Amino acid sequence: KDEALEKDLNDVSKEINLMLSTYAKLLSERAAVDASYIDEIDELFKEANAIENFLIQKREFLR
């Protein structure tokens, strides 16, 4: 009766929470991958910047 309806409502709520939480995990992992790519771009830029500093000081010494 109504009791069975309430208990299966509990199962329904549990299942919906499970799916939304799994989706949240999916999105968190994807966002982590994107953030890692961004950090790699930043590191590449820093390497370039160091090389540029080296060339700038060599050029100033040559002049």
Partner: protein
């Protein structure tokens, strides 16, 4: 000479890392775009299944309702036939 070649090798390593990173980003995007559609599939299907189970339990309740209603209707019909026969007896006697 050696310094220029070393610095050229460093610059190229940078170029190849950038190229590799763009390729990685693109492949990841194709993958993630498949994943999102998979989620929209599963969400609608599961919500339909849960509504399904709720309706199933209701169908059990209504089946019990029909069983009880049919039993009571059959007994009521027996009551009507019994009363009709009793009344026919009393009519004819008087």
């Amino acid at each position: 000479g050696l310094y220029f070649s070393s610095l050229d090798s460093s610059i190229d390593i940078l170029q190849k890392r950038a190229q590799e990173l763009i390729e990685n980003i693109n492949k990841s995007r194709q993958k993630d775009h498949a994943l999102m559609t998979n989620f929209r599939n599963s969400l609608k299907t599961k919500v339909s299944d849960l509504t399904e189970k709720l309706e199933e339990r209701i169908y059990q309740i209504y089946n019990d309702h029909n069983k009880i209603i049919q039993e009571k209707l059959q007994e009521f019909t027996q009551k009507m036939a019994k009363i009709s026969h009793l009344e026919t007896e009393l009519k004819q006697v008087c």
